[PDB]
Amino acid sequence: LHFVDQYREQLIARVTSVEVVLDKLHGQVLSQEQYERVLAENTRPSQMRKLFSLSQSWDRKCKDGLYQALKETHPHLIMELWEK
Amino acid sequence: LHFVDQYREQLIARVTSVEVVLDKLHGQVLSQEQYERVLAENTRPSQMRKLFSLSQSWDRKCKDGLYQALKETHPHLIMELWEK
Amino acid sequence: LHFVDQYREQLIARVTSVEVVLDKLHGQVLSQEQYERVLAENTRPSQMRKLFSLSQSWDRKCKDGLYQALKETHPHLIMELWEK
Amino acid sequence: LHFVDQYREQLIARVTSVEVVLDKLHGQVLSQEQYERVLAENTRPSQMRKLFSLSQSWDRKCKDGLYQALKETHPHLIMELWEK
Amino acid sequence: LHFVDQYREQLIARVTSVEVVLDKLHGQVLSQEQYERVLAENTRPSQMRKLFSLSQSWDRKCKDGLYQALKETHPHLIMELWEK
Amino acid sequence: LHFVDQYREQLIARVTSVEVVLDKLHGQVLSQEQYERVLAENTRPSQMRKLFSLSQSWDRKCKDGLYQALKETHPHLIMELWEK
Amino acid sequence: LHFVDQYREQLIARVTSVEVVLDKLHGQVLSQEQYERVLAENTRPSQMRKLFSLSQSWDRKCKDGLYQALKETHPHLIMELWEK
Amino acid sequence: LHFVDQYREQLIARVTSVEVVLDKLHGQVLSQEQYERVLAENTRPSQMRKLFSLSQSWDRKCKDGLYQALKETHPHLIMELWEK
Amino acid sequence: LHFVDQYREQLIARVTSVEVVLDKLHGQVLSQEQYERVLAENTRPSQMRKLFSLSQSWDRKCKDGLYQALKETHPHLIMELWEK
Amino acid sequence: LHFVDQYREQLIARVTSVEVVLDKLHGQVLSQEQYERVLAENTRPSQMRKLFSLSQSWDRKCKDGLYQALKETHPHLIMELWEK
Amino acid sequence: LHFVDQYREQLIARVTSVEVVLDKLHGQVLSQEQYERVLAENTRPSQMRKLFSLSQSWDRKCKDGLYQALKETHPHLIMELWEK
Amino acid sequence: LHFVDQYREQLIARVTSVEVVLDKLHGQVLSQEQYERVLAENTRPSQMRKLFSLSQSWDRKCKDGLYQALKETHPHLIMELWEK
């Protein structure tokens, strides 16, 4: 069981800079359509929720990419959950 | 007879934050499918209704978990029903 | 029947300083999520409407708090309705 | 046969300010549930349609209330149909 | 002969809030199965019909309960028929 | 003379939940074939009739089981007949 | 006597996710026709009923498969019956 | 036995972009009606299910087309099943 | 010879709203049993046929009631046959 | 034989705005019940089908009215079929 | 011996779009009654079965029409059987 | 076969200025209702899709008008597809 799959209920309520963490994954994991659909929600918590709805088709390449981007953007949050 | 099973007709007309009380139960009690099916109703009273249709396969672990989450989200609602 | 519950059709069309009456209620009655969700409407009449959708889970503590904040912000409006 | 019951096919294609004419009827004719259900349609013509589905249980008090509110909101439309 | 048993042909064409009048009877008169079977019809007039098919096993407790809930939900319909 | 053997003309005109009272008796009193044959009638009064056609080979075990299941499903009907 | 053959009256009133437990058995035990026929019932308790009507041609391979799928989908229900 | 016909139980729980894989097949294999009927389900897992109900009249052209489109949309999923 | 008794082969091929013309006759002419039996046919032409099988025990009250209800529901068909 | 009765197989595959062509016919030809039943189909081609099942009791007023409404909504379709 | 009369057991297990192949035959070969009766089955394989029960009164016009419509809707199935 | 009807899968993923190509077609081909319904989608790819659902009732006048407006708005895209 991966790191993101266990604390999923914790992250969806605290990540703020949705746009800059959405940017880095554009070229590899997801196509154009999935990038566009996220703009429909128009609230910080809801958007992230929709993203985790696509966790059904992630394998280790894609989950590991997500953990990579989330460690590069915030060195205080990922640290804070990993300590527990 | 448990607390939730007797006053069931009272809660389905008053619970507001459907999403945040659905969030906490994801990882343990129910699978992904039951989590997705609830989005179909698209009205605050109806959604909760569908959830109580699954009370057929709950035992004390699950009823006690739900009572726990409802005590954590509203410290005024559960209080108000427990007084009566 | 409380004061706010009777003239509800009167208030939603005249309250101007939505932000400063939303501020005082933050710490006690409602959580973070309901505070954020109100930003979706983006019009003075619509926003207040959404707030009154949550009156289903208010008891005397919360209704009385709202009456309190509305008396502190506008000493001309609440008086004007109370005279009639 | 009342005024609203005869020209029903005419009104459902022209009424614009659905929200403010729905507001005035809240306290007397319909309960909370019917007030909430109308938000499901999300199109100006469809919503009013659903409202007329409740004409089955209106009597003269309620039809007269509806004609009253529709005369108070638009002094050009109700006049325009009554002339014919 | 009870009130519900004589004007049965009048009610099946006018009751709108099927769901909220079905809710109140859940705990005492009927079991879970009859509560679920009503969802099969999926039209306002048809559903109520099926309910009256169970009038064969009602005695005064159950007829009186139904009359009670229908007086509590609509104070205009029961009034309007009782006057005649 | 047993309870069911005397009011045989009374029950066949009032029992509604045929399926759930047929269910409980499956494992002990009757075999699979008689369970299947009852589906041929396709009417609430007729089906029950067919069941009583097997009263020729019941002894106290089976009649007592039937009275048991019918008291468990309807606590209002069996009471209502036993009072008289 | 197998596990499913004794507590059959217990399962038909509690299994909720009919579709996802019907899925796993598709490839080996039953053909396409029996898979399609189950859609006719359109109620959670009834559908499951029809499945057990095919228990006439099951041997240990098929009963063991069904017990397998029901243990994989719900680790709380099969446990709760196995304890008694 | 083809690739899609063996791992059918694997795909129906993981395919995300239903719309864009439905789009490419329009012009050749299926008519307009089958394209329209898929909108009824309104849930990610259910929709795809209905599509596989038409596998009765596919031959190598049509199955091969489906494998082609599913390889073009997700270069990570089809890989992941083909490795095993 | 009455009106309905002469054109018996004409009506059984054209009456559509069987249910709403069956409703009006419930309270006086026919009992509950005959009302329930009609649901067995499940086709518009066949149902009416069964009703005319009971013309053996009709007198003028009941035939006149039937002609009354069919004139009240359809003002175009009864006219069209009466002209000829 | 009327225009609508001959080309019936052509229209049922092309009429799009079911709602606005259903609106105009409400007041004269059909009652409320038939107006409500049409919402059950929930697909553009199927709905029209059900409507044509009622052509059994139409005379020249009703068929001619339908041809009128269909000429008022689409001045391009009725023209296109009438040319042939 | 015609084509349809030889592969009768082959077609009844593979034809999917029952409705659109039933549509084209309406105007010439069969009347309204047989067109309505097919709706009773409510399963894809069974419906077609009933159709072939009318093969007792087909001559070359009607068999040739059915083969025509079945070649027009599916250009892959008729091909696949004709090759063998 | 027209130009738009063959490369329809190409256009639905690239057209940007929905509003200005919807404007020019207002007065002739489609009525007010179809113009209003398109606002429901609220995503650039989805909207155009809905428009192509009305291709069932276009003839050469309307398809030719659509091709005209799309050639007038973008002199780079229509050229780009016509070259292939």
Side-chain angles (χ1 to χ4, degrees):
Chain A
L1 72 183
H2 219 290
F3 168 81
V4 293
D5 198 22
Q6 182 177 346
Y7 299 115
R8 192 193 68 87
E9 51 183 302
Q10 195 63 47
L11 300 185
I12 63 167
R14 277 196 182 183
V15 157
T16 49
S17 66
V18 180
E19 184 174 355
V20 79
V21 76
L22 179 61
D23 188 18
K24 298 184 185 302
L25 290 183
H26 176 262
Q28 302 167 358
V29 291
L30 46 81
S31 298
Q32 188 79 8
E33 186 75 7
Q34 289 72 2
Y35 171 66
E36 176 187 0
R37 185 186 290 270
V38 76
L39 278 312
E41 298 284 355
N42 194 27
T43 19
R44 292 184 304 181
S46 296
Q47 292 183 355
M48 285 301 291
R49 181 179 308 275
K50 187 62 174 174
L51 183 74
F52 273 116
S53 300
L54 299 185
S55 285
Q56 293 295 110
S57 52
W58 294 159
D59 70 89
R60 281 187 180 78
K61 287 179 165 300
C62 302
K63 296 176 181 178
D64 200 70
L66 178 68
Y67 166 74
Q68 195 74 9
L70 280 176
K71 188 209 304 185
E72 292 176 2
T73 294
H74 287 83
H76 282 75
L77 194 57
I78 302 302
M79 211 81 186
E80 183 181 358
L81 259 60
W82 192 274
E83 304 165 8
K84 292 170 54 182
Chain B
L1 73 183
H2 219 290
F3 169 82
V4 292
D5 198 23
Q6 183 176 346
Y7 299 115
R8 191 191 67 88
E9 51 182 302
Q10 195 63 48
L11 299 182
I12 62 168
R14 278 196 182 183
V15 157
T16 48
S17 65
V18 181
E19 185 174 355
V20 79
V21 77
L22 178 63
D23 187 18
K24 300 184 186 302
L25 290 183
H26 175 263
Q28 301 168 358
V29 291
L30 44 80
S31 299
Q32 189 79 7
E33 186 75 8
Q34 289 73 2
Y35 170 67
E36 176 187 359
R37 185 187 290 269
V38 76
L39 278 313
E41 298 284 355
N42 194 27
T43 19
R44 292 183 304 182
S46 296
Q47 291 182 355
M48 285 302 291
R49 181 180 308 275
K50 187 63 174 174
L51 183 74
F52 273 115
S53 299
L54 298 185
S55 285
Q56 293 295 110
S57 51
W58 296 162
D59 68 88
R60 280 187 180 78
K61 287 180 166 300
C62 304
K63 298 176 181 179
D64 199 69
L66 180 70
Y67 166 74
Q68 195 74 9
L70 279 176
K71 188 209 303 185
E72 291 176 2
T73 292
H74 289 84
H76 283 75
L77 194 55
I78 302 304
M79 212 82 186
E80 183 182 359
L81 260 59
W82 193 274
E83 304 166 8
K84 292 169 54 182
Chain C
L1 70 181
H2 220 290
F3 168 81
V4 293
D5 199 22
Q6 184 176 347
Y7 299 112
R8 192 192 67 89
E9 51 181 302
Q10 195 64 48
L11 299 183
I12 63 168
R14 277 196 184 182
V15 158
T16 48
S17 65
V18 181
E19 184 174 355
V20 79
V21 76
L22 179 62
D23 188 18
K24 299 185 186 302
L25 291 182
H26 174 261
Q28 301 168 358
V29 290
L30 45 80
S31 299
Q32 188 78 7
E33 186 76 8
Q34 289 73 2
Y35 170 65
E36 177 187 0
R37 185 187 290 270
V38 76
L39 278 312
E41 299 284 355
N42 194 27
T43 18
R44 292 183 305 181
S46 296
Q47 292 182 355
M48 284 301 292
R49 182 178 308 275
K50 185 61 174 174
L51 184 75
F52 275 115
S53 300
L54 298 184
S55 285
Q56 293 296 110
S57 51
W58 295 159
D59 68 87
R60 281 185 180 78
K61 289 180 167 301
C62 303
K63 297 175 181 178
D64 199 69
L66 180 69
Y67 165 75
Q68 194 74 10
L70 278 176
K71 187 209 304 185
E72 291 176 2
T73 294
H74 288 84
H76 282 74
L77 196 58
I78 303 304
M79 211 80 186
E80 183 181 358
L81 259 60
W82 192 273
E83 304 166 8
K84 293 170 54 182
Chain D
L1 70 182
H2 218 290
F3 166 80
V4 293
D5 198 22
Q6 184 177 347
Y7 301 114
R8 192 192 68 88
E9 50 182 302
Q10 195 64 48
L11 300 184
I12 62 168
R14 277 195 183 182
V15 156
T16 47
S17 65
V18 180
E19 184 174 356
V20 78
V21 76
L22 180 62
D23 188 18
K24 298 185 185 302
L25 290 182
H26 175 262
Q28 301 169 357
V29 291
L30 44 80
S31 299
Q32 188 78 7
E33 185 75 7
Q34 289 72 2
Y35 170 65
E36 177 187 0
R37 185 188 290 270
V38 76
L39 279 312
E41 298 284 355
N42 195 27
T43 20
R44 292 183 304 182
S46 296
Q47 292 183 355
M48 286 302 292
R49 181 180 309 276
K50 185 61 175 173
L51 183 74
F52 276 115
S53 300
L54 299 184
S55 285
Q56 294 295 110
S57 51
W58 294 159
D59 69 89
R60 281 186 179 78
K61 288 180 166 300
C62 303
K63 297 176 181 178
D64 198 69
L66 179 69
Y67 166 73
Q68 194 74 9
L70 280 176
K71 188 209 304 185
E72 291 176 2
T73 295
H74 289 83
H76 282 74
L77 199 58
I78 302 303
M79 212 80 186
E80 183 181 358
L81 258 59
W82 193 274
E83 304 165 8
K84 293 169 54 182
Chain E
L1 71 182
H2 219 289
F3 167 80
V4 293
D5 198 21
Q6 183 176 347
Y7 298 116
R8 191 192 67 88
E9 51 182 302
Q10 194 63 48
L11 299 183
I12 63 168
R14 278 197 182 184
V15 158
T16 47
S17 65
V18 181
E19 184 174 355
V20 79
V21 77
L22 178 62
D23 188 18
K24 298 185 186 302
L25 292 183
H26 174 262
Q28 301 169 357
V29 291
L30 44 80
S31 299
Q32 189 78 8
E33 185 75 7
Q34 289 72 2
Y35 170 65
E36 177 188 0
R37 185 188 290 270
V38 76
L39 278 313
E41 298 284 355
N42 195 27
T43 20
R44 292 183 304 181
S46 296
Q47 292 183 355
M48 285 302 292
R49 180 180 308 275
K50 185 62 174 173
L51 183 74
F52 274 117
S53 300
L54 298 185
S55 285
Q56 293 295 110
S57 53
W58 294 158
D59 68 88
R60 280 186 179 78
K61 288 180 166 301
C62 303
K63 298 175 182 178
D64 199 69
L66 179 69
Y67 165 75
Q68 193 73 10
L70 277 175
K71 188 210 304 185
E72 292 176 2
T73 294
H74 289 83
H76 283 76
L77 195 57
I78 303 304
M79 211 81 186
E80 183 181 358
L81 260 60
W82 192 272
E83 304 165 8
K84 292 168 54 183
Chain F
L1 72 182
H2 219 290
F3 168 81
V4 292
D5 198 22
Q6 184 176 346
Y7 300 114
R8 186 187 65 90
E9 51 184 302
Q10 192 62 47
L11 299 183
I12 62 168
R14 278 196 182 183
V15 159
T16 49
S17 66
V18 179
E19 184 174 355
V20 79
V21 76
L22 179 64
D23 187 18
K24 299 184 185 302
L25 291 181
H26 175 263
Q28 302 167 358
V29 291
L30 45 81
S31 299
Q32 188 78 8
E33 186 75 7
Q34 290 73 2
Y35 172 79
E36 176 187 0
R37 185 188 291 270
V38 76
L39 279 313
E41 298 283 355
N42 194 27
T43 21
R44 292 183 303 181
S46 296
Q47 292 182 355
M48 285 300 292
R49 181 180 306 273
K50 185 62 174 174
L51 184 74
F52 276 116
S53 300
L54 298 184
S55 285
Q56 294 295 110
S57 51
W58 292 159
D59 68 87
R60 280 186 180 78
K61 289 180 167 301
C62 304
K63 298 175 181 178
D64 198 69
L66 179 70
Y67 167 74
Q68 196 75 9
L70 278 176
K71 189 210 304 185
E72 291 176 2
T73 293
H74 288 84
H76 284 76
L77 196 57
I78 303 304
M79 211 79 186
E80 183 181 358
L81 261 60
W82 191 273
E83 304 165 8
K84 292 169 54 182
Chain G
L1 71 181
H2 220 290
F3 167 80
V4 293
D5 198 22
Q6 183 176 347
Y7 300 115
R8 193 191 68 88
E9 51 181 302
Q10 196 63 47
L11 300 183
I12 62 168
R14 278 196 182 184
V15 158
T16 48
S17 66
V18 181
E19 185 173 355
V20 79
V21 76
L22 178 62
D23 187 18
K24 299 184 186 302
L25 290 182
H26 177 263
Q28 302 167 358
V29 291
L30 44 80
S31 299
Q32 189 78 7
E33 186 76 7
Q34 289 73 2
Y35 170 66
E36 176 187 0
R37 185 188 290 270
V38 76
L39 278 312
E41 298 284 355
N42 194 27
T43 20
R44 292 183 304 181
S46 295
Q47 292 183 355
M48 285 301 292
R49 181 180 308 274
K50 185 62 175 174
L51 183 74
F52 275 117
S53 299
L54 298 184
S55 285
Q56 294 296 110
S57 51
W58 293 159
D59 66 87
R60 281 185 180 78
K61 290 178 167 300
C62 304
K63 298 176 181 178
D64 199 69
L66 178 69
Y67 165 74
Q68 195 73 9
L70 279 176
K71 188 209 304 185
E72 291 177 2
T73 295
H74 288 84
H76 283 75
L77 196 58
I78 303 304
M79 211 81 187
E80 184 180 358
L81 260 59
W82 192 273
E83 304 166 8
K84 292 169 54 182
Chain H
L1 72 183
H2 219 290
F3 167 80
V4 293
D5 199 22
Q6 184 177 347
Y7 300 113
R8 192 192 68 89
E9 50 183 302
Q10 194 64 48
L11 300 183
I12 62 168
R14 279 196 183 184
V15 157
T16 47
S17 64
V18 180
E19 184 174 355
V20 79
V21 76
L22 179 62
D23 187 18
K24 299 184 186 302
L25 290 183
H26 175 263
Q28 301 168 358
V29 290
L30 45 81
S31 300
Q32 189 78 7
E33 185 75 7
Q34 289 73 2
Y35 171 66
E36 176 187 0
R37 185 188 290 269
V38 76
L39 279 313
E41 297 283 355
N42 194 26
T43 19
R44 292 182 304 182
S46 295
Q47 292 182 355
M48 286 302 292
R49 181 179 307 275
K50 187 62 174 174
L51 183 75
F52 275 116
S53 299
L54 297 185
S55 285
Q56 293 295 110
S57 52
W58 295 160
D59 68 88
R60 281 185 180 78
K61 286 180 165 300
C62 303
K63 297 176 181 179
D64 199 69
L66 179 69
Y67 164 75
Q68 195 75 10
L70 279 175
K71 188 209 304 185
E72 292 176 2
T73 294
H74 288 83
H76 284 76
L77 197 56
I78 303 303
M79 210 81 186
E80 183 181 358
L81 258 59
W82 191 271
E83 303 166 8
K84 293 169 54 183
Chain I
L1 72 182
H2 219 290
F3 166 80
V4 292
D5 199 22
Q6 184 176 347
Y7 300 112
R8 186 187 65 91
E9 52 183 303
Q10 192 61 48
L11 299 183
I12 62 168
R14 278 196 182 183
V15 160
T16 49
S17 66
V18 179
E19 185 172 355
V20 78
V21 75
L22 179 62
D23 187 18
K24 300 184 186 302
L25 291 183
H26 175 263
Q28 301 168 358
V29 290
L30 44 80
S31 299
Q32 189 78 7
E33 186 76 7
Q34 289 73 2
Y35 170 66
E36 176 187 359
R37 183 189 290 269
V38 76
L39 279 312
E41 297 284 355
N42 194 27
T43 20
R44 292 183 304 182
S46 296
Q47 292 182 355
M48 281 301 290
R49 182 181 306 274
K50 184 61 175 173
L51 186 75
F52 274 117
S53 300
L54 298 185
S55 285
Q56 294 295 110
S57 50
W58 291 158
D59 66 87
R60 281 186 181 78
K61 287 180 166 300
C62 303
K63 297 176 181 178
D64 199 69
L66 181 71
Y67 166 73
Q68 195 74 10
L70 278 176
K71 188 209 303 185
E72 292 176 2
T73 294
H74 288 84
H76 286 76
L77 196 56
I78 303 303
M79 210 79 186
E80 184 181 358
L81 259 60
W82 192 273
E83 304 165 8
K84 292 168 54 182
Chain J
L1 70 182
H2 219 290
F3 166 81
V4 293
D5 198 22
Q6 184 177 347
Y7 298 115
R8 191 193 67 87
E9 50 183 303
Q10 195 64 48
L11 300 183
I12 62 168
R14 278 195 182 183
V15 157
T16 48
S17 66
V18 180
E19 184 174 355
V20 78
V21 76
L22 178 61
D23 188 18
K24 299 185 186 302
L25 290 182
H26 175 262
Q28 301 168 357
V29 291
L30 44 79
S31 299
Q32 188 77 7
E33 185 75 7
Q34 289 72 3
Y35 171 66
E36 177 187 0
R37 184 188 290 270
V38 76
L39 278 312
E41 297 283 355
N42 194 26
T43 18
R44 292 183 304 181
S46 296
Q47 292 182 355
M48 286 301 292
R49 180 181 308 274
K50 188 63 174 174
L51 184 75
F52 274 116
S53 298
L54 298 185
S55 284
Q56 293 295 110
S57 53
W58 295 161
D59 68 88
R60 282 185 181 78
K61 286 180 165 300
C62 303
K63 298 175 181 178
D64 199 69
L66 178 69
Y67 166 73
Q68 194 74 9
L70 279 175
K71 188 208 304 185
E72 292 176 2
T73 294
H74 288 83
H76 284 75
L77 194 56
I78 303 304
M79 211 80 186
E80 183 181 358
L81 259 59
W82 192 274
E83 304 166 8
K84 292 168 54 183
Chain K
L1 73 183
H2 219 290
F3 168 81
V4 293
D5 199 22
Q6 183 177 346
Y7 301 113
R8 188 186 67 91
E9 50 183 302
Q10 193 63 47
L11 299 183
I12 62 168
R14 279 194 183 182
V15 159
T16 48
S17 66
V18 181
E19 185 173 355
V20 79
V21 77
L22 178 63
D23 187 18
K24 300 184 186 302
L25 290 182
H26 175 263
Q28 301 168 357
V29 290
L30 45 80
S31 299
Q32 189 78 7
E33 186 76 7
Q34 287 72 3
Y35 169 66
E36 176 187 359
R37 185 188 291 270
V38 76
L39 279 312
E41 298 283 355
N42 194 27
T43 19
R44 292 182 304 181
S46 295
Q47 293 182 356
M48 283 300 292
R49 181 180 306 273
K50 185 61 175 173
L51 185 76
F52 275 116
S53 300
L54 298 185
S55 285
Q56 294 294 110
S57 52
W58 292 159
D59 66 87
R60 281 186 181 78
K61 287 180 166 300
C62 304
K63 297 176 181 179
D64 199 69
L66 180 71
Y67 165 74
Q68 195 74 10
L70 278 176
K71 188 208 304 185
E72 292 176 2
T73 294
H74 288 83
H76 284 76
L77 197 57
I78 302 303
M79 210 79 186
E80 183 180 358
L81 261 61
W82 193 273
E83 304 165 8
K84 292 170 54 182
Chain L
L1 72 181
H2 219 290
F3 168 81
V4 292
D5 198 22
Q6 183 177 347
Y7 301 113
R8 193 193 68 87
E9 51 183 302
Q10 195 62 46
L11 300 184
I12 63 168
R14 277 196 183 183
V15 159
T16 48
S17 65
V18 180
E19 184 174 355
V20 79
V21 76
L22 180 62
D23 189 18
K24 298 185 186 302
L25 290 183
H26 175 262
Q28 302 169 358
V29 290
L30 45 80
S31 299
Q32 187 78 7
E33 188 76 8
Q34 289 73 2
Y35 170 65
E36 176 188 0
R37 185 187 290 270
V38 76
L39 279 313
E41 298 284 355
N42 195 27
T43 22
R44 292 184 304 181
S46 296
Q47 292 183 355
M48 285 301 292
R49 181 180 308 275
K50 187 63 174 174
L51 183 75
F52 274 116
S53 299
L54 298 185
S55 285
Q56 293 296 110
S57 50
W58 295 157
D59 69 87
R60 281 185 180 78
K61 288 179 165 300
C62 303
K63 297 176 181 179
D64 200 69
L66 178 69
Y67 166 74
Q68 194 74 10
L70 278 175
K71 188 209 304 185
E72 292 176 3
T73 294
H74 287 83
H76 282 77
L77 198 58
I78 302 303
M79 210 80 186
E80 183 181 358
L81 259 60
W82 194 274
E83 304 164 8
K84 293 168 54 182

